[PDB]
Amino acid sequence: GDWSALGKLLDKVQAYSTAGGKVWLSVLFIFRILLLGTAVESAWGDEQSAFRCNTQQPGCENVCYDKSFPISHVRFWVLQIIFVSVPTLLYLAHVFYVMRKEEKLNKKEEELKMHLKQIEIKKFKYGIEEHGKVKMRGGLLRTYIISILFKSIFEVAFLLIQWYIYGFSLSAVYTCKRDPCPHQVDCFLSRPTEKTIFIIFMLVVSLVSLALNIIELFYVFFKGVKD
Amino acid sequence: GDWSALGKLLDKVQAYSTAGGKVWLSVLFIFRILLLGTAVESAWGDEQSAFRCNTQQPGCENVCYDKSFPISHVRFWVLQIIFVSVPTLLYLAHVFYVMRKEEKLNKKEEELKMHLKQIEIKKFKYGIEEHGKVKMRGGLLRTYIISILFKSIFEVAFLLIQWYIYGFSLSAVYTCKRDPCPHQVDCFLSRPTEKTIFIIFMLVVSLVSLALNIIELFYVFFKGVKD
Amino acid sequence: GDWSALGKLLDKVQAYSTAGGKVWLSVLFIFRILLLGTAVESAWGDEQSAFRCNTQQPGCENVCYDKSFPISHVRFWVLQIIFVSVPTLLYLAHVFYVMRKEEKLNKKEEELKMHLKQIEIKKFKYGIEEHGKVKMRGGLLRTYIISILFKSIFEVAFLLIQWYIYGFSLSAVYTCKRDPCPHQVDCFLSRPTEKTIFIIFMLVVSLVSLALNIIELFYVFFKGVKD
Amino acid sequence: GDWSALGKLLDKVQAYSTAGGKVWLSVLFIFRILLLGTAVESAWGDEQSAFRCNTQQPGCENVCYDKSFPISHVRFWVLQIIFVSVPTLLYLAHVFYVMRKEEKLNKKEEELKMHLKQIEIKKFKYGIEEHGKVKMRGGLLRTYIISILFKSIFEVAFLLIQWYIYGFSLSAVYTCKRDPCPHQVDCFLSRPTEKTIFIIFMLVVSLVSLALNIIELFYVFFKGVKD
Amino acid sequence: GDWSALGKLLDKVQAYSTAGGKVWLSVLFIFRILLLGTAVESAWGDEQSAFRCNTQQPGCENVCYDKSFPISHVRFWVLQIIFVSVPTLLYLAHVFYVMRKEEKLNKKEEELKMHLKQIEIKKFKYGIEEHGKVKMRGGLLRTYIISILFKSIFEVAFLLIQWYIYGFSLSAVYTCKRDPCPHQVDCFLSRPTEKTIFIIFMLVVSLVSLALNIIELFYVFFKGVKD
Amino acid sequence: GDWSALGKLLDKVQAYSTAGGKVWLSVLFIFRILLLGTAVESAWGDEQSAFRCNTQQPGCENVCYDKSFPISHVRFWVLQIIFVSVPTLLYLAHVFYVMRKEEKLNKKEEELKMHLKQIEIKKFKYGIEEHGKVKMRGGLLRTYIISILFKSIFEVAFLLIQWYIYGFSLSAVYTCKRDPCPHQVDCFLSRPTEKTIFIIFMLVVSLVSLALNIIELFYVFFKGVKD
Numbered sequence A, B, C, D, E, F: 001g002d003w004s005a006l007g008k009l010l011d012k013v014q015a016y017s018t019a020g021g022k023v024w025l026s027v028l029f030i031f032r033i034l035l036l037g038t039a040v041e042s043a044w045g046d047e048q049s050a051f052r053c054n055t056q057q058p059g060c061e062n063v064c065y066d067k068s069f070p071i072s073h074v075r076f077w078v079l080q081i082i083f084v085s086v087p088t089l090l091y092l093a094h095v096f097y098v099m100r101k102e103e104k105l106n107k108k109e110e111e112l113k114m115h116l117k118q119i120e121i122k123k124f125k126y127g128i129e130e131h132g133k134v135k136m137r138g139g140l141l142r143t144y145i146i147s148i149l150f151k152s153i154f155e156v157a158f159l160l161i162q163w164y165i166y167g168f169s170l171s172a173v174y175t176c177k178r179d180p181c182p183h184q185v186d187c188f189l190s191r192p193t194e195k196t197i198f199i200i201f202m203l204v205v206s207l208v209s210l211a212l213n214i215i216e217l218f219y220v221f222f223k224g225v226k227d
């Protein structure tokens, strides 16, 4: 694949994050990315060539396959993985902006050495005191919360879309009724059992990730209330 | 693929750029390159072998396929990606030229230590004061503006070409009328729905990028007016 | 494949581990990962195309194949390898937490230089004395033991599942009785002998790993009793 | 592919070159190498299997294909790319020889510290004064000019060969007359339109490169006359 | 392939070894690994699809192929390569243990500065005097000898197994007698000549390696007697 | 491919070599390795599936193909490349042995500071004076000459074998006479013209390399006579 850039960026962002965020990144790296690339994507290798129908009408097989699978599961999961990673990058960008502000303020104070008072109050407001121990307060906390909410809503929306379109199982026999197939025809899928097992596994993984980020949100809210 | 060199050059150029430029580079890396390489290009894997027509005339299938698809979408998108990346490299080259001029002027001034006056006026004219904080003024701003305009016009031209040639959807049945096929024949495509979905997705991404660079141009014009 | 990330993490974790753990990691890297990727996975390359049955009823071949192989052995082994590696990562995370606590306590004591007494008692309780010679005592030992137990139970559960589903051999002829195949039909597998040999080899490797981790658990219990 | 070594050597040689040479190297890296590897080579993926003729005489298809395509375009372009890169490596070798001579002369002068006069005259003759600012004078200029001429003549020779053999377009229908095909037969190509488009694109790129190196030669001649 | 980890470990272990061991490692890297990966494994690319028999009885081809090839040569050679590399890793582990003991003893002596006498006698017994010039004496020599013997016996056992199973040549025509094939049938192999040539080449390489390690054992025994 | 290790070793050995040796290494890297991997090996991609004969006798096609091609050209060229690279590695090993001797002698002399006389005479005999400027004298020259002779004889032997077996062209039609084909049959090859062109190209490259190493041998003999 080509997941090198996204993996590198996630490795860059995982340095400064909460424990729940680190666990979420770890499970995303292990189960969502590694498992799909290694063995899951090989199952959908001949979902088109092994598909066949019980007719001799030309062109009915392509129409029935297009009717049966509007979009492959592997591509759907890739799109989901892409769409549940942007807000972390947004948080990384905001952290880098905070770092730039810290560097400029440090340069100004080094130049200086009531200005000390305002420099210190600005360094405390952004949570930059130890030169490498950026804390979450004011803006970073807001960005983190909105990122968590966006990730959760994207995941639940994708899950609902998948539930509406396909369901959570693949029957061994599919009934096709569309031109130019005369009347109704019978078509047979390929590897229904493995696909059902992997779909259930991915559903479980998605639910676990949802619960994990919910726990992370609750913990960060409690930490904010602590102050 | 072989996108390593272009990715490395873009990673080199992203160090000194405006926020809008950085966001544009990020979206180009994520959606334009990564998504196409990972899953999109696999859909157009058997657009030739799965294509079939309702006739037994030899050689009609090849002619009808050539009539239907003058150029594959994947190759068109690759060409578009290549053609909407050169001006950034031109800006990078101009920045490197400015760096070379800065190094030579620094060498001359170190040698010296009214010549100081002209050295300082030349260092201010090119915006080279802090030895690593090159600012946009005079020539760099002009190059940046012309690069943005060239990128925008290339993108809109490619979009217009795609609209004229194909459209934005693929019908499940295609009508073919060309020798040696007798009279008219019916041919059936492969995976119309996935291809339509991905075409719409790419169109949305291109429009978003166009809006982003328009916003970047407006912001840089306002910044120039600020002076 | 894409085993780079997991291999890197295991290379990170192997630095601080017992001898039995190092031997287990070595055998996992050599026989479980390298062997499967190099030659074993190529055997299951045409288990679908070479499968054929003695009938001309349309769609019976797909149904019989789905009946015969609920899940491929290669995917099962990949899932097993993934599921017998998490607790080591958990131990690595706990070790990193101990390192963070050590760094914070060192910072506090450097700041100080009865507080010395409590600093020393906390550094001894976590087994952090030589600044890079973390010892197993109290919590690390408990985490190590529970990780070993979890790994063992996961391995035995996977072995039992494989025994119940398939067995440990593949007969050259399979009997299929499922709709729409009329009455009973005969279907012939592909490369039964190589698959049986590799299944037996993997079973032997799994048993060896089980014995090795049992020995490691006994040795660590004896070491704990030594104190 | 395996273009890593040649790319590394070109990256090594681009450090010391004229602006025209750098632009030529950039366009060679972008359009000649990257574009061909990414998408162009995939078009010629089934030029043999999709080729078919209107006959049932055994062995006529292979003979007609061999008659139609003496050598594939992709292989021809690869050979051209290889044959229009050697003189740059020759220039790199000569530069390395100059560097070796500079190092030996520096060692001899460091040992010494009329010999100073001859050391200085030899350091000026080879254009080695600043220890890392090698200038083009005498021999390097001659090597550069002959390298440019060799590159230009190789490119024009390859272009003429391609014009004589194929032309610049591929007709959808080819007429074959060769044993054992009885009388004349009709054979149909695969993807004529994409191949014609890419051939025209490569021709334009080659012409642009020719013009660029002509401009570089004129500029370097003017620079030589400047002295 | 995935031979990166084993190659890295062998590169780590080759630093401290006898000349015969280094030559054996070099020949193993060149002829056993590189040659098999580059060109040898491509020959066994269609040993299943090109195999065909002279009958129309369904399912006889699979049975006859399974009868003819119990296990492919490429997989057998991969298993042999894996099984003739473990003892070197065991020697590497013992060397690392010696290094750990050396580091601990050095730490204790640095702390000290009759204890000097025992420290020196322990440093001489393990052959650790120059801090990086570990010599073979007592235990390392025993481990080296047993590793050489284990490697030799594994190689000869694999050679005997291959001789018993297949032989050293592949006849162009194979006779098959097994159900459901009626009476006897004739089946034809694929590329017999290349496979025979490569089998003979691998046999010669294995014999050369056996002779080389025998010479290494004799030389190390003579060196031990020298003391 | 897997040419990384051999390429790395050749990159290691090219540091200390004569100009002719460096040119030979460069041409070997460019034309022998890069060209074969990039485009040449793709031509022999379907030399088995596209091969067909004018008969309906079962099993005659495999026999005729085995008769026609005892060993593929690509594998022959890979074997040749492997067999014309060992003596350079032998020279590298001898150079490393000389380096080890130099390091030990330097250690002994540093310890010392008539022994100086013998140390200096041994350092001059092996041509080790400047600590990094090893010269060819006595043994290194002999090893270099024998390596050149071995390389030349291996290349000429491989060329003679290829001339005897195949020739230097491939006719479009092959006549096959071997059981079970009745009487004589006609079989047709695949892509004869491209294969002939590439064979002629490889022959020219081999002759050029032979001439280059002959020139290198003559030059080194003249240099030896110079002393």
Ligand SMILES: CCCCCCCC(=O)OC[C@H](COP(=O)(O)O[C@@H]1[C@H](O)[C@H](O)[C@@H](OP(=O)(O)O)[C@H](OP(=O)(O)O)[C@H]1O)OC(=O)CCCCCCC
Pocket: A019, A219, C100, C104
């Ligand atoms: C049931 C768990 C409920 C809490 C779950 C909390 C989340 C969880 O499960 O792991 C993350 C957590 C915090 O780790 P983290 O390093 O971020 O935080 C440490 C500590 O918990 C405080 O946050 C700070 O120290 P102190 O206290 O001011 O001296 C300081 O962090 P910060 O403030 O500078 O950033 C650290 O010393 O790790 C723990 O071990 C918590 C202690 C209890 C671990 C044992 C379980 C009670």
Ligand SMILES: CCCCCCCC(=O)OC[C@H](COP(=O)(O)O[C@@H]1[C@H](O)[C@H](O)[C@@H](OP(=O)(O)O)[C@H](OP(=O)(O)O)[C@H]1O)OC(=O)CCCCCCC
Pocket: A100, A104, B019, B219
């Ligand atoms: C609605 C936003 C409209 C503006 C969008 C502007 C574009 C946008 O959305 O992000 C980029 C922007 C500029 O970032 P950047 O680092 O380039 O610029 C900072 C700052 O904005 C000034 O440009 C300079 O400081 P000062 O001011 O002279 O002390 C100095 O940059 P420069 O001059 O040395 O290169 C920096 O401190 O980031 C912000 O946070 C803007 C502040 C407002 C952020 C909050 C929103 C108002």
Ligand SMILES: CCCCCCCC(=O)OC[C@H](COP(=O)(O)O[C@@H]1[C@H](O)[C@H](O)[C@@H](OP(=O)(O)O)[C@H](OP(=O)(O)O)[C@H]1O)OC(=O)CCCCCCC
Pocket: C019, C219, E100, E104
């Ligand atoms: C039959 C083997 C039964 C034991 C199997 C034990 C497991 C096994 O087979 O290998 C691991 C083992 C321990 O190695 P490791 O480096 O962890 O431990 C060394 C030593 O054994 C003690 O643990 C400590 O030294 P001391 O003793 O306090 O001076 C110190 O470790 P630690 O305490 O600081 O972490 C080390 O010097 O290696 C051996 O050579 C054991 C000695 C006997 C090797 C010869 C066989 C008796």
Ligand SMILES: CCCCCCCC(=O)OC[C@H](COP(=O)(O)O[C@@H]1[C@H](O)[C@H](O)[C@@H](OP(=O)(O)O)[C@H](OP(=O)(O)O)[C@H]1O)OC(=O)CCCCCCC
Pocket: B100, B104, D019, D219
């Ligand atoms: C129409 C252009 C015609 C010329 C095209 C020339 C080719 C072209 O388009 O780009 C390359 C060119 C030379 O760049 P390069 O760094 O090699 O050369 C710089 C300069 O031009 C002189 O060559 C030298 O300085 P000076 O002058 O002695 O103080 C010194 O180089 P050198 O001598 O130590 O190696 C450098 O300062 O870049 C320019 O900006 C030229 C100035 C005009 C740029 C603006 C356009 C006039």
Ligand SMILES: CCCCCCCC(=O)OC[C@H](COP(=O)(O)O[C@@H]1[C@H](O)[C@H](O)[C@@H](OP(=O)(O)O)[C@H](OP(=O)(O)O)[C@H]1O)OC(=O)CCCCCCC
Pocket: E019, E219, F100, F104
């Ligand atoms: C027919 C060859 C029979 C012997 C084959 C022996 C094996 C073979 O063919 O290559 C390996 C061999 C030993 O190399 P290696 O570096 O291990 O050993 C060198 C030397 O031979 C002694 O072993 C030691 O020096 P000294 O002697 O105490 O001053 C010291 O090694 P060590 O003791 O510190 O580890 C080294 O100086 O290389 C040679 O050149 C041997 C000399 C003769 C080379 C010329 C042929 C006679």
Ligand SMILES: CCCCCCCC(=O)OC[C@H](COP(=O)(O)O[C@@H]1[C@H](O)[C@H](O)[C@@H](OP(=O)(O)O)[C@H](OP(=O)(O)O)[C@H]1O)OC(=O)CCCCCCC
Pocket: D100, D104, F019, F219
């Ligand atoms: C027709 C060519 C016939 C000779 C072909 C010779 C082979 C060829 O074509 O390139 C290699 C050659 C030698 O290069 P290399 O760096 O090995 O050798 C240089 C020099 O030639 C002498 O060998 C030594 O210097 P000096 O002389 O003692 O001060 C010293 O090398 P060494 O001794 O310390 O190792 C070096 O300065 O390069 C040349 O430029 C030769 C000079 C003439 C180049 C111009 C052509 C005459």
